C-alpha cells in the first residue's frame, strides 16, 4: 500500500501545518504560498503570498515609507500559522513585510485583510521559519486577543518578543494587533532591554512551541548565554532552553515566570527544545502517574547539550512532564519570592538585580501576579521523565493521543520516519513500530497534528505532506502474528479473523470475541495427535482457548484437502478423521509420516483461525520388521503374517508380535566371511530370532549379489540363532581385482529377506591378482591359507594346485626363501668417489628381514652399508656406499638376500656410475 | 403608378360619358364628336357631328326651309346620350339644329338615322351641355318609350320642357320622337305656357339629372323665380331646385308632381342641385337607414343658395334622400289634396290657382293621377340629410356603390379631385381618402360612372377622362399602415403580406386569414424581451394575437441577421435565440444595448409580417463598475474579478457582487485639493467600498496626470473609506498659469481604476506667476498661505523662501503695510480751474481699504477727495479735485496709502494739467 501524500505544491518549498477540527480540511504554511487541502491531500487551493520586492534593512516598508536602500525580489516565509474559527478565517502571519500578518478566508483563503499600516501591523524583521508561536484565544465579545513570541534579530525598539495583542472582527479594521492595554508606563508587551543587546549583542528569544491551558498560556524558547555560560566577554553563544507561562488574564504582564527545562540521562544533558506537544493521558498513562482526567501533560524532544541552535546535535531525548508538576514548581518558586529571600534573578530582562519583596498572601494556582517583584525568573531548573533516547538518528518531532486509554506517542526524525511509541512506565514496555512514510532521504517537521477522526497523522517535511495512518494492524496476517507485534492498537477480531483495534472490531465488547494476549489465540489441542492411515472416521476430541462462541458453528479442515463437520458438547469440539478413501491421497509419496496442520474454520467467518501438528503414520506400507519398529513410529510388525501394521489383533497371534527391535529378526556379524574363487566351501552365519516357517512357508536360502552371477544357494536353519549356505563355489568373471565384497542377502519362503542392519557381506577373494612374485604371497597373510606354488609359477592354495610333488611352497613362519629378487631402478645413478653416497635402491622381491640384507648390498666391488629405518621392506632399500678409490670406475649393484647364493641374487640392470 | 386616361381626342372639347354595362366599352359625349373607347381608355373610334352651318334663330333649319337669317359654321354640343341595349345603338341628342337626334350602332358608330324633318324631331334650340337629361325605358314589342327634358329658351310654342316620345325600332321611319299620345286636347307632352312667359320673361327649367325607379321616372330640375323669390316685377332670377315624378304607364301625364327639395347645415341653405345618383345602400347603410333590399337611396349635391346658376358658389353639400321618404312625401301630398284642402299650388305652369277638389279614393303608391286635380305643386319642400360639406372647394359630382355592404360614395370637386366617401350615419364615422386622379388644375363633369365590373370609375373633365380605381389598398405595405388608412376597402391579407379588399384575399372567409382592426394585426411579444449576448441560444416565447392559421410552418428572424426555425404549441411560438457566434456580430460597435426588430416571416407568404422591440444587451464590455450596474441596463459588478457579467454566479463568491450603484468603489469628494509645486506634501483621500486586494493583487497608486510629467506615487489604503499618497512634490514646466487644475487617477493592481463621478481633480498652484507686487499677494487668500519675501523680491511661502530674518511678509490680517505703489495712468488729463473734476487714477499698489486712500490724494497743492462707490481696491480711485486757483497752471499727481511715508508714496508720471 502506498502513503496519500501531497507533494510541494510548490515543489520549490514547505514551513507549517495544521488541521481543521470540523472539516479536516488541512492548511499548510509555506514559503510564498499557503494551502489549503483535503483530508485525503487532494490541492483544494493554492494562496500566492510570496516574492514581494523588499529589504529586511527598511524599517517601515516600502509601502509606507521609501527607503534608501535597494530592493530585490524575497521570499515570504510563512512563520506562523492559526485557525481562527470563530472569525471562520485563519491567520497566517509572514515575514519579509517587517512581519505583516495576512487574514485568509476559511473556506476559498480569500485575503479578508492585511494590516500593514501602523507599527503594531509590524511583528518582527525575522527571516526564519518557525522561530515563532503562539496561540489565539477567544471569548464572546467583549471577551478575547492573540499572545505570540518572535525572534527580534536586535530590533529591540521595533518589536516586542512576546505581546498580548488585539483582534477585531473586522479584518479592515485598523485596531488589528494593538496591544491589548497600553499604557505610558506599562503595555501589555514584553521588550529585550538595549542594555543587554550591548551586554551581549546577538541575544534573541525564539519560540518553538505554544499552547493554551486552562486558564493561562505556555511557550518552550530558546535564549542565549546570560551567566550560562560565564564568560567575561562576548564570544561563544549556547542556549538555554526555558518555559514561559502567562495569566490569560493579566493585561499588565505581571504573570511572566521563565524557568529553564531538560533531562538527563545517565549524565548526558539534554537542554535544547525541537518540539512539544500538550495532550491527555488517557486511563492508563493517568493512573500510574497519578493524575485527575482533566490533568494535562507535555511530551518534548530535546538535543544534547547547549551548542548550535541552528544545527543541533543528532542525540536527542524525548522527555515528559505533568502540568501538575510544573505548576507546582512555579507555585513553589512564587510563594518562595513572597517570602523574601534572594533576588528575581532574570538576566536578560533586569541587568540590575532587583530583590525579592516579602508580603502575606495566600498563594494559590489562581495568582496572576502584583506589583511587586513584579516579572521573575527561576534557579531551580525543571527536570523531566526521559523516555525514549535516540542516538543514531536525531528526533525532530513530537505528538500523542490517547486510544482506548492506551497512550501512544508519534516521534519525528531527521531520516523522514515516524516511531510509534507505547509510553508505558505507568505501564511497563516501550517502542511498537516504526515507519518510513515520509521521505526516505532526509526529515521531518514539528508540526505534525492528528485528523479529526484520528485516523491518520500528518506528517510535514521540507519537501512534502504524507497522510500516515495511525494504528494498521490490518498488516497482521494471522492471531499469532498480531498479538506478536505488541503496538498495542493491535487485537485479533477472533470471528474476522482480522487483526485491528478494539472500537473496529464489531462485538468485541462479548466475550471471547476479541484477543488481546496470544494466549487467547489462540491455543488448540487434539486428543489423539496421531490417527493411523489405516484407520478412518476416528473420534477426536479438540481442546481450544481463548475463542469466542463458536455456537455459529465450525468445521474441521485437516489441510485444503479435506472438511468435517463437527458437533460441540462442553468445552470441547467433536470432529471425526477422514475416510481411508480420503486420507491415503495425502500420505502416498510422504512415506513414514505427514504432519498435518489440522485447523479449525469458523462457520461465521469462514477463515481458518487455530492450527495444531496432526499427525498420520501409514504402518503397512513397510516391508521389512527393522522399517517397521525401528523407525521413527509406532508400528507392529506380525512375525508370521510378515506385515507391518498398528493393530495388535491384527497380527496373526500373539507370540507372533514384535515390538522391539532387538526381537525382529536380524543376522548377526561374525570374523569377516572369506570365500575363495573355486572353493567348495559352507558359510556359517549367527542372527538372531529367525522364524520357523510356518504352515505353506518354505525354507531358507543364501543370495549372493554379484554382478557377473548371482548365486541361489539353499541353507538351513538350524536353530533362531545360526544358519549355514550348502557346499558351494562362487566366482566371478575377469580377475580384475583380487578382494571383492559382496552383498549377501537371506532369504526365506522366496521373496522374504531377513533384515541385515550391519550389512555383512562375503568377500570374495582370488590367490594373486596382485602378486606375481614368490615374495609377495609369503607375505600376505597366514590367513588366507594362501601360497606360492611353484611348477605354475603362479599362486594359489593348496587346494588349488596339483601336488606332483609333496610340496607347494608356504611361508612356514618366514622361514622360506624365496626367491629370484630383482632390480627394478636405483636413484642416484651417479655418486662421487669417495663415496657417502646415499643409494636408493627399489626391487620387487627382497628379503623380509633388514638383518638379511645388511652385508648383502655391495656397488660391484664396494661395500654398501644399508640403513634401517630408510628400508621398506622387500620394496626398497637405502644404501650408503663406502670409500670408491678402487680402478672400477663405473660398476653394476649386487643384492644377495640372505646369502650370494645363484638363485638368489640380483644384478642392477643399469650400472651405478662414479665420478 | 398614373392612371388611364383618354385626353381629349378632339383636344378642343368634352360633355358627356357614358358605360355599356355588358361591353365596358366607354361611350363619350363632347362638342362635334362622340367616341367610343376601350375599357382601357384607348379610342375605339371617333364620330364627326361637328361643325355644322347653321342659324339657333331659324325654325325648322336650313335643310327643312329657307331662313332669312345669315348662318356660320358652329359647333354642335352633344345635349344627352343615351344607350339603347335593346335597339343594339345609342341615342346622341345633339343640338344647333333645333337640337335634332342622332343614333349610332353601338359597334360601328354608324349612323343609323337622324330624324330632321318633322316638327318633334326638333329637341330645343338650347345650346347649353348638360342642362338636358332623361331615360329610356323599354319592354318587349308592343310596350316602350322616350322621357326627356329640356330647356326651351322661350320658345314654349316650339318645343315642350317635358315630353314622353316614341321611338320606333326603324331609324329611317318617320314616327321617331313622336309623342306617345296625342289628342287635340292633351298631348303626353308639357309645355310652357306664353302667359308665364309674359310675366317673368326668362323663365325656363334645366334638367339636371334623370332616373328610373321602380315604375316612375324623376327628374332633378332648376327654375326660375316665381312667388320666389317675391317680386312685383322682373328683375333678378333666383333658382329653385325641385323634383319631378311622373308615372311610364300614364300617357295622359296626369302624375305629374313636383317638390322642392333642399337641405340645411347649422343655419346654411344648400337650394342648388349640382348632380345626383340613384344607388343602392348595401347592407350596412340599410339596415341603420331601416330599408328593405329593394329600397332605392338618392345621393345628390346641392350649392349654398339660390344664386347664380350659370356660376354657382363653392360652397357645397351632399345630402341624402331615401326614396321611400319621398316617396310617402308625394302620397302625403296627394292624400292631402284628395281631402280637398288648399289649391294645387304650381305657379309656372297654372297662373290662376285653380283648388283641388275632395274625393273618395285609396291612395296608394301605385296612383297614377286623375283628370280633376290634375298636374299639381309642392308645399313643404323636402329636407334632406346632410352627409359631408365642402367649404373650400366646391363639389361637383357624386356617385356610389355597394362593397362588401359598406357603401363607398364618390364626389368630384372644382379642382380636379376625387372624395372616397365612407357614409357612416348608418355606421359611424366620415371621408377615408382623396384622389388627383383626373386634372390638378380646374373642375370633373357629374357624368361619373362605376365600370360594370366596378374595379375603376371613370371620371370626366373637361378636358379628359380618367379611370380611377375606386379602391386601391395595395398602396399599404404593411398591417399597421393598412389598417390605419381606415378607408373601409382596406384589410390585410395576413398570409399574403398585402392590404385589399374581402374579395381578392383568396380563402379570406377562414378563420385569422384576413385582418380588419388594427389588433388582429398583429399584436405580438416576447417573453424573454432583454437576452444577454453572453448566453446562447436562449429558448423564447411568443404570443400573437389576430393571426390566421400558422400551419404552414414559422421562422423567426431578428433581421435580416439571422433566421431560426420554430415549433408551435398551444397557442405560442417556440424559438431560440442566436448563437453567440452569431449575436455579437450585431452587437460590435452598438455598445450599451442593440434593440431589433425580430420578426415573424410565414412560411406561405415568406414576407415578415410582425415584429416587437427585442433588446440585446453585453455586459461584459464594460470595463468599470460604474458603467456596469450605474448604466441603463441591468448588469452585475463583481468586485473581485473585477469583471461585468449578466450572471451572478459567473462572480468571484457571493460577497463579491455588486447590484447597486452606491456599493461600486467610487472616490468621494472633500475640500478642494491644493497643492503647491515643490513641496513635499501628503494628499488625503476619502472614498468608499475600497476593495481589499486579494491575492495575487498589488496596492494603490496615485496617477497625476501632467501634461509635463505625469507622476506614479504608491499610496496607502487604509479602510474602505480613505486613501493618501506619500510625501512627494509636484511640478509643472511652463510657469505659464498660475492655477492648472490636474485629473489624477487612483488606481491599484497596476491597471485597475478607481470610478471618479465627481472627477476629482488636484489643483496644482505655483505662488505669483500672477502677482508681481507686495500688494497683490496679501490681497489674495489667507489660504493659499502664499506670501511675500522681500528679499527675492518675489513671492512665495515661507517653505520656499530662505529666512535670513526672522520675517518674510505675510498680511497678519491686513495690518500689513506694503508697499510701492505705482500710477499707471489716469483719465481727465485736463481740467478746469475751478475744479469740480472727476479724476479717474489707475495703479497697482494701492491702500485695501477706503479710510486710508481718502485724505491721500492730491494733485499738487490741490486738495482732492476721493469717492467710495467709484473706488475699485487697490486697482484704481476715482476722485474729485476741488478748488484749482493757486498759482501752479501744471501739476504731478500724489497719493499717500496711509501715510506720505518715503516708501509709501506715488507721482504720476505724466503731470495733470489745469486749462
Redesign the interface.
Known amino acids: 500500500p502506498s502513503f496519500v501524500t501531497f507533494r510541494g505544491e510548490p515543489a520549490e518549498g514547505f514551513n507549517h501545518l495544521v488541521v481543521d477540527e470540523r472539516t479536516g480540511h488541512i492548511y499548510l504554511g509555506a514559503v510564498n504560498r499557503i494551502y489549503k487541502l483535503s483530508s485525503d491531500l487532494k490541492v483544494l487551493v493554492t ?3 510570496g516574492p514581494d520586492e523588499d529589504n529586511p534593512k527598511c524599517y517601515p516598508p ?5 527607503c534608501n536602500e535597494p530592493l530585490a525580489s524575497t521570499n515570504n516565509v510563512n512563520k506562523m500559522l492559526l485557525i481562527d474559527y470563530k472569525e471562520n478565517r485563519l491567520i497566517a502571519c509572514g515575514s519579509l513585510y517587517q512581519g505583516i500578518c495576512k487574514l485568509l478566508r476559511l473556506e ?7 494590516p ?2 501602523k507599527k503594531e501591523h509590524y511583528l518582527s524583521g525575522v527571516n526564519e521559519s518557525g522561530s515563532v508561536f503562539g496561540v489565539i484565544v477567544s471569548y464572546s465579545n467583549f471577551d478575547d486577543k492573540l499572545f505570540i513570541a518572535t525572534a527580534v534579530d536586535g530590533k529591540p525598539e521595533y518589536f516586542p518578543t512576546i505581546s498580548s495583542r488585539k483582534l477585531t472582527k473586522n ?4 485596531g488589528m494587533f494593538a496591544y491589548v492595554f497600553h499604557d505610558e508606563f506599562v503595555a501589555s508587551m514584553i521588550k529585550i532591554p538595549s542594555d543587554t543587546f550591548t551586554v551581549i549583542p546577538d541575544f534573541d528569544i525564539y519560540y518553538v512551541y505554544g499552547f493554551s491551558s486552562g486558564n493561562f498560556v505556555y511557550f518552550l524558547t530558546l535564549q542565549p548565554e546570560m551567566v550560562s555560560p560565564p564568560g567575561s566577554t562576548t564570544k561563544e553563544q549556547v542556549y538555554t532552553s526555558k518555559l514561559v507561562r502567562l495569566c490569560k488574564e493579566d493585561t499588565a504582564f505581571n504573570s511572566y515566570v521563565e524557568v529553564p527545562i531538560g533531562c538527563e540521562r545517565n549524565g548526558v544533558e539534554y537542554r535544547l527544545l525541537q518540539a512539544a506537544y500538550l495532550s491527555k493521558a488517557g486511563a492508563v498513562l493517568g493512573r500510574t502517574l497519578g493524575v485527575r482526567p482533566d490533568d494535562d501533560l507535555l511530551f518534548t524532544v530535546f538535543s544534547k547539550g547547549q551548542k548550535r541552535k541552528m544545527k543541533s546535535l543528532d542525540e536527542s531525548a524525548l522527555c515528559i512532564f505533568i502540568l501538575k508538576q510544573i505548576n507546582d514548581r512555579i507555585k513553589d518558586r512564587l510563594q518562595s519570592c513572597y517570602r523574601g529571600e534572594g533576588t528575581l534573578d532574570l538576566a536578560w530582562l533586569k541587568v540590575k538585580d532587583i530583590p525579592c519583596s516579602s508580603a502575606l498572601l495566600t498563594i494559590d494556582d489562581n495568582f496572576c501576579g502584583l506589583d511587586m517583584n513584579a516579572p521573575l525568573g527561576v534557579s531551580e531548573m525543571v527536570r523531566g521523565i526521559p523516555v525514549f533516547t535516540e542516538d543514531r538518528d536525531r528526533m525532530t518531532s513530537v505528538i500523542a493521543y490517547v486510544y482506548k486509554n492506551h497512550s501512544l506517542a508519534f516521534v519525528g526524525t531527521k531520516s523522514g520516519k515516524l516511531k510509534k511509541i507505547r509510553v508505558d512506565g505507568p505501564k511497563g514496555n516501550a517502542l511498537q513500530y516504526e515507519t518510513v512514510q515520509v521521505v526516505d532521504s532526509g526529515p521531518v517537521l514539528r508540526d505534525m497534528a492528528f485528523s479529526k477522526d484520528h485516523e491518520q497523522l500528518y506528517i510535514m517535511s521540507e519537501r512534502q505532506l504524507t497522510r500516515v495512518p495511525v494504528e494498521s494492524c490490518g498488516q497482521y496476517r494471522s492471531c499469532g502474528e498480531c498479538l506478536g507485534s505488541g503496538d498495542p492498537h493491535c487485537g485479533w477480531c477472533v470471528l474476522h479473523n482480522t487483526c485491528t483495534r478494539k472500537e473496529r472490531c464489531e462485538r468485541s465488547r462479548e466475550p471471547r470475541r476479541f484477543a488481546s494476549e496470544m494466549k487467547q489465540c489462540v491455543r488448540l489441542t487434539v486428543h489423539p495427535n496421531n490417527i493411523s492411515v489405516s484407520q478412518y472416521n476416528v473420534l477426536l476430541v479438540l481442546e481450544t482457548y481463548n475463542v469466542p462462541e463458536l455456537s455459529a458453528g465450525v468445521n474441521c479442515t485437516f489441510e485444503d484437502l479435506s472438511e468435517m463437520d463437527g458437533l460441540v458438547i462442553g468445552n470441547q469440539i467433536q470432529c471425526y478423521s477422514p475416510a481411508a478413501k480420503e486420507v491415503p491421497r495425502i500420505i502416498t509419496e510422504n512415506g513414514d509420516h505427514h504432519v498435518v496442520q489440522l485447523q479449525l474454520k469458523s462457520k461465521e467467518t469462514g477463515m481458518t483461525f487455530a492450527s495444531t501438528s496432526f499427525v498420520f503414520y501409514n504402518c503397512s506400507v513397510h516391508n521389512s520388521c527393522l522399517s517397521c519398529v525401528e523407525s521413527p513410529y509406532r508400528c507392529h510388525w506380525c512375525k508370521y503374517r510378515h506385515v507391518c501394521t498398528h493393530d495388535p489383533n491384527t497380527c496373526s497371534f500373539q507370540e507372533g508380535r514384535v515390538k522391539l527391535p532387538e526381537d525382529c529378526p536380524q543376522l548377526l556379524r561374525v570374523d569377516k566371511i572369506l570365500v575363495p574363487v573355486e572353493v567348495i566351501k559352507p558359510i556359517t552365519l549367527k542372527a538372531k530370532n529367525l522364524p520357523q516357517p510356518q504352515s505353506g512357508q518354505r525354507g531358507y536360502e543364501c543370495i549372493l549379489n554379484i554382478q557377473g552371477i548371482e548365486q541361489r544357494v539353499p541353507a538351513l536353519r538350524f536353530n533362531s540363532s545360526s544358519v549355514q549356505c550348502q557346499n558351494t563355489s562362487y566366482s566371478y568373471e575377469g580377475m580384475e581385482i583380487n578382494n571383492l565384497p559382496v552383498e549377501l542377502t537371506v532369504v526365506w519362503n522366496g521373496h522374504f529377506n531377513i533384515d541385515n542392519p550391519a550389512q555383512n557381506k562375503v568377500y570374495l577373494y582370488k590367490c594373486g591378482a596382485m602378486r606375481e612374485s614368490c615374495g609377495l604371497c609369503l607375505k600376505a597373510d597366514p590367513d588366507f591359507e594362501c601360497g606360492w606354488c611353484q611348477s605354475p609359477g603362479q599362486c594359489t592354495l593348496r587346494q588349488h594346485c596339483p601336488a606332483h610333488e609333496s610340496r607347494w611352497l608356504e611361508l612356514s613362519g618366514a622361514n622360506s626363501k624365496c626367491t629370484n629378487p630383482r632390480i627394478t631402478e636405483i636413484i642416484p645413478v651417479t655418486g662421487p668417489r669417495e663415496g657417502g653416497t646415499k643409494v636408493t635402491i627399489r626391487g620387487e622381491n627382497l628379503g623380509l628381514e633388514f638383518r638379511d640384507i645388511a652385508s648383502h648390498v655391495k656397488v660391484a666391488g664396494v661395500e654398501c652399508s644399508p640403513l634401517v629405518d630408510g628400508y621398506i621392506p622387500a620394496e626398497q632399500i637405502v644404501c650408503e656406499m663406502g670409500e670408491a678409490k678402487p680402478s672400477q670406475h663405473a660398476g653394476f649393484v649386487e643384492i644377495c638376500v640372505a646369502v650370494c647364493r645363484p638363485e638368489f641374487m640380483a644384478r642392477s640392470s643399469q650400472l651405478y656410475y662414479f665420478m
Request: charged share 30%; no cysteine; hydrophobic share 35%.
Open positions: 494562496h500566492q503570498t516600502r509601502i509606507v515609507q521609501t476559498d483563503l480569500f485575503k479578508l485583510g492585511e500593514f499600516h479584518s479592515e479594521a485598523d
